[PDB]
């Protein structure tokens, strides 16, 4: 894997239909859940990049070289069949390896994006919060809805809550 999407974060949120990643906060005003648009779009861009690169066709034209109606001579027929089968094997190998390799990277990059957003919030809170261990951040200055929103759009000033938080350890 990477840094655990299916690790310390135990499960995903089926209720999160607003994006691919997001925050779920809890305070004195109730329950809150909002998606993160930029990190979601980062993931979406990369996968879209893959798909559009993979979904593609040749502009190379191949013709008929044997005959379904009146069979060609055996010796040239067997060479042709032997060659075609060989190309089939190569493309069968390429195809299955391609898809397998891409799927490994797709899953891992999604892991990557989740880890990147997570450790970003961690640096965003400085010493005002502590790592829960399940992807959560226990805040030590009772953050209100406006405070939470400042964390979401990366504007949270750590040094304006620092005194209160470090006191409460």
């Amino acid at each position, epitope marked *: 894997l990477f840094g655990a999407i299916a690790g310390f974060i135990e499960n995903g949120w089926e209720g999160l239909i607003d994006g691919w990643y997001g925050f779920r906060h809890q305070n004195a005003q109730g329950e809150g859940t909002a998606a993160d*648009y930029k990190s979601t*779009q980062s993931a*979406i861009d990369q*996968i*879209t990049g893959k798909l559009n690169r993979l979904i*593609e066709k040749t*502009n190379q034209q191949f013709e008929l070289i044997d005959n379904e109606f009146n069979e060609v001579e055996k010796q040239i027929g067997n060479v042709i069949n032997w060659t075609r089968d060989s190309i089939t094997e190569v493309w069968s190998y390429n195809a299955e390896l391609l898809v397998a390799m891409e799927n490994q990277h797709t899953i891992d990059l999604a892991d990557s994006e989740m880890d990147k957003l997570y450790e970003r919030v961690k640096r965003q809170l400085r010493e005002n919060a502590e790592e829960d261990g399940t992807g959560c951040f226990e805040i030590f200055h009772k953050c209100d809805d406006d405070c939470m929103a400042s964390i979401r759009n990366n504007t949270y000033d750590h040094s304006k809550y620092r005194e209160e938080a470090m006191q409460n350890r």
Partner: antibody
Amino acid sequence: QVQLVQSGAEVKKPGASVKVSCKTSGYSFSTYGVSWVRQAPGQGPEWVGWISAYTGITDYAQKFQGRVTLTTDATTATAFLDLRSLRPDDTATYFCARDKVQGRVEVGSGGRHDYWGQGTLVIVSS
Amino acid sequence: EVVLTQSPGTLALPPGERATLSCRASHRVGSTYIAWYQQKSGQAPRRLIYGASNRATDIPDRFSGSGSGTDFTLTIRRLEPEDSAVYYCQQFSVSPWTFGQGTRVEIKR
């Protein structure tokens, strides 16, 4: 029915600041975002910039970096194009076009400049 | 950047004949990131082809795009009077998204 309706034509003095609007109807907003193309009289089309209505991320061409600012609906699903320090070269027809799927993975270029606005002439002269 | 150069500058052909419009890129662009547009004097450009060969909604099947790599082609199988316009190719693989200088199509008789 998806339609892009832009503001009326405009006349500005050189060195001023213009603001073209683009009202959105038909689709949902923040599912695509907008590309802007401008066309000088008797000349071809040239791409100006793109903004996501979903993330807010903007991408400009080098020519306009620093004097163009793209923004999106206060809440009414409408995109804006803000140009300033208007040269006489900035005299052109400014088109907005709905462009590129956002909060979703989709193959192909079906949502790439698929619907345009009627246009907006900007005459920059004294 | 990617330079799209179209040819010819001007194409003049009688109605019902076959028109072939070229767009040649400086760099290899994936077929998905290429579009063709029609524009008449005064109006907004309507999208004809997207992804190098896919027809847009309600576009007549006499407009067919083809090609790959650096060579792309818009074919008007049988010209109609209302096909007299200017045609631009576009690339949006890598920014800046660039346009071809265009090809004008004119009829006859």
